[PDB]
Amino acid sequence: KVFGRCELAAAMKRHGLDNYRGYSLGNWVCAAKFESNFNTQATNRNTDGSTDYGILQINSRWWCNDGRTPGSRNLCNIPCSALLSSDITASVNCAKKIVSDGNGMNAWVAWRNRCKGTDVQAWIRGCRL
Ligand SMILES: [Cl-]
Numbered sequence: 642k643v644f645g646r647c648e649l650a651a652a653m654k655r656h657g658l659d660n661y662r663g664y665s666l667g668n669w670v671c672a673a674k675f676e677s678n679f680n681t682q683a684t685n686r687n688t689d690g691s692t693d694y695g696i697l698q699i700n701s702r703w704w705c706n707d708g709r710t711p712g713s714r715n716l717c718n719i720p721c722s723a724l725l726s727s728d729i730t731a732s733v734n735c736a737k738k739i740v741s742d743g744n745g746m747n748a749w750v751a752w753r754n755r756c757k758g759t760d761v762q763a764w765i766r767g768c769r770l
Pocket residue numbers: 646674
């Protein structure tokens with residue numbers, strides 16, 4: 642599913658991501674924009690052999706099981722395919738664990754490089770929330 646911007650903002654809010662770990666909703670929408678362009682089916686293979694999955698490009702080395710990332714963990718206790726669903730619940734639940742791991746949203750390199758420090762409220766501007 643390719644979410645609209647405000648559609649995704651609303652879904653993220655409903656699932657408790659707004660202000661989670663102190664990160665306002667616009668931070669999460671911005672991260673999803675630059676990780677996946679709001680496409681739940683996004684995947685990307687990394688040089689290390691891990692793969693990133695879903696709207697927030699959650700990586701198989703630590704967070705989900707894909708059966709093809711040797712030596713990896715599955716800290717969200719989920720198949721990586723669950724992160725590709727039109728239903729964002731699994732991605733939200735796993736993102737909550739990731740952002741709680743110590744480095745906040747810097748876990749998402751694209752958030753650090755493209756969202757952090759910017760006017761992230763623009764990502765929710767105009768949305769009925
Ligand atoms: Cl957009």
